[PDB]
Ligand binder design. Structure first.
Ligand SMILES: [Mn+2]
Length: 482
């Protein structure tokens, strides 16, 4: 019967991390049905990236990790693995921040911000205690949880009655009406959170698991096509869900004042989450807790709880996704297979200490600013995963027949230059807030190292495709290949 009735949705329900909810709600509060075009373009852009990743994993037979280990010296291998691990621990930081904010939400502030931290450590204990074939059952249960929250949440979206013309125009037309610095920050966070560096690696690794006959190129072609349909189904589902979430939050939060929210929640059933808001009539600083509060205010008392459990399930799925990706990237780059327990413990700890410090000495708004900064960090770390994949899918020696057509190379050059332009704009927008002489120091040195690794990657990819009539004799193994 249907050979696609079930496959495809699984990858999406793992593409929908809590970050695509938090950055979503920040963008929806900062602007209405405006940044949706950024969402659509990012979804298409990640569709292209996942197509490239599946291509590489299918035809080559290796993953990004194995090819990177094979085709790099020790220093760039190590620094690239460090950046990938930084991306994974940043995703885990976003997950723990979301879970902690949700847990602070549940008890009406009785549990402290590090109470959520302790429950995440309990979750890691649960993972290590299970570590069995029944883990897939728990993953299915949590996937059903996020699925049901998404379904009831789409019901709430259609209840919200979004103005059709406004969000249709915002989606199909890329205008930026009255945009400024915070909306720039939210757009960059969206483009860096909808798609993430470690998804490409993990997708390639999972693609490698599929056995390929290799006798004829036909089986490779059909496998690549089927995986492309899988990826496009997942991306379309993710984009639809994020469109629903962005539209509803922008409808409920665009030109919303503290007095307005207090007045609506004073008229509703809910009370403690009615009195949370202050009385200032100014613009509202918006985080996950207030988003859940207004959700429960408008769409019913159970909305708070369902949003909370959905966020928790998304965080758990993202945690499993991250530990899988981390195990694969270490096994590839550094050629060591650690148990899943080692990965989850390492990533969870390396995420938990900074979040513990910030939560214990700062407030909720600082947490939201911090995890927005993690989304932007994922944006800045995108190139370190988007150049190697193009380098290895355009390389004539691992794959001869299924190389890259000139249209694909030029559009990938466009992706790289565009992402570089957005990152450069963000850096020039954010750096001026360092008003101390000689303070540039370590941060500037790290930025210089970032640019040096970027230049190294640019040189490598230029060797991969071009280098004709202009190349250096040293490090000539790239063009010939191994
Ligand atoms: Mn995402």
């Amino acid at each position: 019967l249907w050979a696609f009735t079930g496959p495809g949705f699984l990858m999406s329900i793992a593409f929908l991390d809590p970050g695509n909810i938090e950055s979503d709600l920040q963008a929806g509060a900062v602007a209405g049905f405006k940044l949706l075009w950024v969402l659509l373009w990012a979804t298409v852009l990640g569709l292209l990236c996942q197509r490239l990743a599946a291509r590489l994993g299918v035809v080559t037979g290796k993953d990004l990790g194995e090819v990177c280990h094979l085709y790099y010296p020790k220093v760039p291998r190590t620094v690239l693995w460090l950046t990938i691990e930084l991306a994974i621990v940043g995703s885990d930081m976003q997950e723990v921040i979301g879970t902690a904010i949700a847990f602070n939400l549940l008890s009406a502030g009785r549990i402290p911000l590090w109470g959520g931290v302790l429950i995440t450590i309990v979750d890691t204990f649960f993972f290590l205690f299970l570590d069995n074939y029944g883990l897939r059952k728990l993953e299915a249960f949590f996937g059903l949880l996020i699925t049901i929250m998404a379904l009831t949440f789409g019901y709430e979206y259609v209840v919200a009655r979004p103005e059709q013309g406004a969000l249709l125009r915002g989606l199909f037309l890329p205008s930026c009406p009255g945009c400024g610095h915070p909306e720039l920050l939210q757009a960059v966070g969206i483009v860096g959170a909808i798609i993430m560096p470690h998804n490409i690696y993990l997708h390639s690794a999972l693609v490698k698991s599929r056995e390929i006959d290799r006798a004829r190129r036909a089986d490779i072609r059909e496998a690549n096509m089927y995986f492309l349909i899988e990826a496009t189904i997942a991306l379309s589902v993710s984009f639809i869900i994020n469109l629903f979430v962005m539209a509803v939050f922008g409808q409920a939060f665009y030109q919303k004042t503290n007095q307005a929210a207090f007045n609506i929640c004073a008229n509703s059933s809910l009370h403690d989450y009615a009195k949370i808001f202050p009385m200032n009539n100014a613009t509202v600083a918006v985080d996950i807790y207030q988003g859940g509060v207004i959700l429960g205010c408008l769409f019913g008392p159970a909305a708070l709880y369902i949003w909370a459990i959905g966020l928790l399930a998304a965080g758990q799925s993202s945690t499993m996704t991250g530990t899988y990706a981390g195990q694969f990237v270490m096994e590839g780059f550094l050629r060591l297979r650690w148990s899943r327990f080692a990965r989850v413990l390492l990533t969870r700890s390396c995420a938990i200490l900074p979040t513990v410090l910030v939560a214990v000495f700062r407030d909720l708004r600082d947490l939201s600013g911090l995890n927005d900064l993690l989304n932007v960090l994922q944006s800045l770390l995108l190139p370190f995963a988007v150049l190697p994949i193009l380098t290895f899918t355009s390389m004539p020696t691992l794959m001869q027949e299924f190389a890259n057509g000139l249209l694909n190379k030029v559009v990938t050059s466009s992706i790289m230059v565009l992402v570089c332009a957005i990152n450069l704009y963000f850096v020039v927008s954010y750096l001026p807030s360092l008003p101390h002489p000689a303070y540039f120091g370590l941060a500037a040195l790290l930025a210089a190292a970032y640019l040096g690794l970027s230049t190294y990657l640019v040189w490598t990819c230029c060797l991969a495709h071009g280098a004709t009539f202009l190349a250096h004799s040293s490090h000539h193994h790239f063009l010939y290949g191994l």
